[PDB]
Every structure is written in C-alpha cells, then in structure tokens.
Design a binder for this molecule. Sequence first.
Ligand SMILES: OC[C@H]1O[C@@H](O[C@H]2[C@H](O)[C@@H](O)[C@H](O[C@H]3[C@H](O)[C@@H](O)[C@H](O[C@H]4[C@H](O)[C@@H](O)[C@H](O)O[C@@H]4CO)O[C@@H]3CO)O[C@@H]2CO)[C@H](O)[C@@H](O)[C@@H]1O
Length: 377
Amino acid sequence: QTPTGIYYEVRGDTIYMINVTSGEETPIHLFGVNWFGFETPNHVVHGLWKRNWEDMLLQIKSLGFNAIRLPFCTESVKPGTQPIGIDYSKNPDLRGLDSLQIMEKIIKKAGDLGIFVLLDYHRIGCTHIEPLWYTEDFSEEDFINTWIEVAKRFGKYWNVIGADLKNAPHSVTSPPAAYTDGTGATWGMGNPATDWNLAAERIGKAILKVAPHWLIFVEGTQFTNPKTDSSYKWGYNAWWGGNLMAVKDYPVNLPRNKLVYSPHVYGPDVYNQPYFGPAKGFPDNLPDIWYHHFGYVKLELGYSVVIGEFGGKYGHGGDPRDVIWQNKLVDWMIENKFCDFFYWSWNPDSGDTGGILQDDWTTIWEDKYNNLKRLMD
Ligand SMILES: OC[C@H]1O[C@@H](O[C@H]2[C@H](O)[C@@H](O)[C@H](O[C@H]3[C@H](O)[C@@H](O)[C@H](O[C@H]4[C@H](O)[C@@H](O)[C@H](O)O[C@@H]4CO)O[C@@H]3CO)O[C@@H]2CO)[C@H](O)[C@@H](O)[C@@H]1O
C-alpha cells in the first residue's frame, strides 16, 4: 500500500492524504508553483546563480504556496548528470552533488515546510517538449522504464504526491492530418501508439505497480479525434496539454481513486488565440471555453481536475489583455471550486509568461501575485 506510511488518493473530486497507520484522512488543496530547470540543459532548477535554493523554498512557502511541480528531463534523473549554472558561494551545501541529489535535497526540504511535490516528466531530452512520449531514439519502453526508476527512488519521499506522466502531449502538424500521421498525440483516434488516453493507462499501470500510494496526473492533448474536436467551435483551438474534451467518451482506463486530469491553460501571452479577440467574445466568452476544454471533467463528470500550468506576464512587458485573462480565470476557478493548481512559473525566466519573481530573481510582481492570492483565500 505504501513505503512511507502516506497514501494519496482521490475521493469524489478531492485529493486526500491518508496516514495508513493512524487512519487519519486529510483533504488537501494544492496551491502550487512550477519551479523549472531540471528539464533544461542546466540540469537544475533555475536561479541558483542569483539565489540560495533554501531561501527560494522559504520565499515560496512565505507566499502561501504548499505545492511545487518539478519539471524534469531524462538526463537530470540519471545519476552523474552534472548541473550547470550554480553560484556555490550562495549554495555551499550543493557542492559535489549531482542533478539527482539536488532534486532529492529540494524535495526533502520542501517536505520539511509541508510542501507537496508533483514530479513532471517534462521533456525526453533537455531542449524542447516532444509531441509524444517517445522519439526515434527513445522508445515508449524506455520512457516507462525511466518512470519506473523515478518512482522507485522518489516514492520514498512522503511529500511526493505522484507523476505527471508526460508534459504537454500535442501535435506538430495540423488536422485532419495530425490525427493519422503518427507524429503527434491523439485521444480516441484508435491507434494505441498515438492515443494518449491508452498510453497514459500503460505508463500509469507501470508506475502504480511500484508506487501504489501515488497519484497519476494525466494531461490533455492538443487534438483528440475529429468527431470530438468538431463537437465544439473552439475544439481546434486548445493548448498543448489542454484538450480534455475526449474524457467523457474515452476515459483513461485507470482506478478512479488514483487519477487526476491535469489541463494546461494559458492566456494571450502564450499564444494569440482567436477567442482572445474582443471580436470573438473575449473575455466573457472564457468561462464557456474553459468549461468545454476541461472544466466539465470536474463539474459534470466529477473527476479531480488540477490545472497543472497557467500564467502570463500580467501586463508587465506583454499583452495587457493578460491582466483581464488572469483575473477572469481566478474568478472562474474560485466560483467553480478549482482550488488545486500549479502556477507557471515561480521563475522569471519563462520567455513568454515571466513568473511570480521579477527578473531580479528576488522580488515578486505584486499585482500578479495579489490576483493569484485570491485562490489561496
Ligand atoms: O521549460 C522551460 C521553458 O518553459 C517555457 O514555458 C512553457 C512550458 O515549458 C510548457 O509546458 C508550456 O508550453 C507551451 C509552449 O511553450 C507554446 O509554444 C505552446 O503554443 C501552442 C498552443 O498551445 C496551441 O494552442 C497553438 O495552436 O500552437 C501553439 C504553438 O504555436 O503552448 C504550450 C502550452 O499549451 O507553457 C510554457 C509557456 O509557454 C518558457 O517559455 C521557456 O522560456 C522556458 O525555457
């Protein structure tokens, strides 16, 4: 049942932490941030050139977050990979430690602060997000074996809630072709080699044999099947990791009490979506978009839905409509009780979204955070 004494599960659409010994069951909310970098060529969370890593965790906790999503790539989780770009005068206790050991230090420290950690297999290599959970050089069995090894090691950390199986499944070509061409993820198409709903079952079973106490977070795709995507006017305009419209007819075949649907959703700073034009109904059009793409999965079907990524520059050097977009989304999440989330990102160095921290890696965008804060209250 569990190597830690803690078992995570979903009841209703709420995530529970169970102390299996005492029998105590606590419902948890995930007020989370993404702290990225283990999936990049640095092979470490970013900003350790400007900050101490512990100081960073303390500051995250001081802002009322109690959860971190930790993106990783294959390399960062194999021993002996060496981190690049760390100021060791600021980080003495990180000297002579590899990308895996830092990852472990960060999680144990987070746990010390009651912070939950979601492990995210973000990239297969360490440069970009592939549309599928395999490449020419890295097979699905290789991907599954990496997850098995991640799960054997990090399953011993009480505060690790589970596995975001693959960051942002998506297409690298357009429909109708994208559905049959074998280069991008699908859902409900039929082909188990591209259909993310079927691959998430395989990879998830594999993880649950070794970390039975974990949760399996399954993102949306970008396109699913033409019948599903055609069912809604904005069916062809979902985010990578964002399209959960096929959950109703093609549910992932996994234990309901272990599964979390985890959509990405973004504003005009990531992509100039047609429904972001006031002409196409922005911003009042947004509740119904979100509903159709992923909101109905919780609100109609009652599964647990955790928004794994959302964010934007909040009018700081980007599209000013992002302020309206972030306000409207928080309003909607509060009204509809989506209280579990990971903001993208803690890091200021996300080129299209910036982060909670400003470019100085020290100070927060007060207004962006203030708006986010309403969800924590
Ligand atoms: O990892 C560090 C890296 O992160 C970047 O932040 C990305 C996230 O890593 C990622 O999970 C997510 O990816 C975006 C992606 O960057 C966009 O190109 C893509 O745009 C899609 C859109 O989704 C579709 O609807 C549209 O049809 O096609 C476009 C592509 O043309 O959207 C996905 C998410 O849906 O979100 C983060 C923000 O982009 C930082 O930007 C980078 O600087 C960091 O190095």
